Design a protein around this ligand. Structure first.
Ligand code: SSV
Lengths: 136, 139, 145, 146
């Protein structure tokens, strides 16, 4: 069961080599997790203004085949693990058009749920609405 | 005596055509105005963490010659006009290396000083430190 | 102003990486969106031109402009509405309305303009080429009004 | 004299366009900075390789990684400190410390890693090429030690 974020590669994501510059794959992880929040946990999205922080702990990408301008890429996100305050997600980046389905890359990211009164910020349980959305 | 912001073109600013993607020239206006504040208006720089915001009203670029990866570009900023709450700046983008000095592009931008209130962003006076810095260091 | 556009529409959802500490969309992103919009237009309405862009054709930006009216925020749905202003041998002048369509009422965030030249990479640098017929026809049919 | 090996230092000042509404540096910018750092390294220490990158040589990223420890802010002066982890054939593994050096006390913001492969454009694809001697030479001055 994966969450699909659809992304069309633009010229500004390419580079003189002719492929998608590597760092854009990490932005797409972000676009995907944020679109998930908006689609299935809007209350957590709203809570980000209040006092909830979703902080990136780490991220990773493995690159397999080159993406090009106008490629339609599915950024397929899965829950790898939820533990107290941390959420680990994994990502397949699959070109679905043009040509045959092609795995361009894979990735991983961990996010921590924090609350931040005073000066520092402290771990808080993954919110219920988010925990609920994540299981589906 | 324009204010000079030096920028080395990186691969992530290029594109498959082989040149600097046009929209990066606009980011460089931002980089240049921020570097200007750190150099010449550090009190204003501090107010930007304390509720002051520089809000873009308009911007413009004219492109003359292609930029490439590893080009050293001088983003040369000049003050065009100050009013109550607005600053108009102009920019020459000059490749200084490799090869001979080459005007790649020119640009313009108007910025407003704003503070965030209950309704949203509201106009405030340009701080005197910034008006003086621009009149002295970007003319 | 209107929910319904009369122009070519490129839909864009604002992401967190397009915001900045002020809390709005950083101004330079609006210029990227002109590029995203014109590329989406090619894929929708001039796919033969899209293919020529891998075969020596280049769209070179001559100039661009934006006027900013109201702030954009993360997760705003923005319509980047593109209209043909002028077609002149090898140059295309296009205008843009940036309309927030959600949340809240339709709001003009910004307007913009851009001139692009159709060029081919040659043994002289870049050389002007006439606007491809497919693109000229697509712009007259999909980006007028 | 220097027990710990030196690292290559790429200086980066955080700009507003690298921040986000949360108020910190958006995480994906740290990966761009690896790119900026490795390119600045080539311009400083392997300029012949830098020229070959306009002449058909390409550095192709195989993988990359970042661990985030403390928030970066607009106007922070960040040193992106690069070291060679290993050179394995046509592949180069580099590691990165991201250290805020101003304002305030030196602060480790993040660490990172990246593997790159040296390739050349053949047809419509790329093929492995040996790491150029100049680049091998330049990276070995910043080797991580056991
Ligand atoms: C099955 C997929 C589950 C995905 C869970 C996604 C969680 C994403 C959290 C995103 C947080 C983003 C935070 C900011 C500040 O950008």
């Amino acid at each position: 069961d994966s969450y699909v974020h659809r992304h069309v590669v633009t010229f500004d994501e390419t580079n003189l080599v002719g492929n998608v510059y590597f760092a854009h794959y990490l932005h797409w992880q972000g676009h995907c997790r944020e679109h998930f929040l908006a689609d299935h946990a809007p209350g957590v999205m709203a809570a980000l203004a209040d006092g909830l922080a979703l902080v990136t702990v780490d991220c990773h990408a493995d690159f397999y085949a080159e993406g090009s301008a106008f490629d339609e890429v599915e950024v397929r996100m899965m829950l790898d693990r939820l533990d107290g305050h941390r959420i680990a997600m994994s990502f397949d980046y699959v070109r679905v058009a043009p040509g045959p389905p092609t795995l361009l890359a894979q990735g991983r990211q961990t996010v921590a749920c924090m609350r931040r009164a005073g000066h520092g910020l402290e771990p808080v349980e993954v919110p219920a609405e988010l925990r609920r959305a994540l299981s589906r």
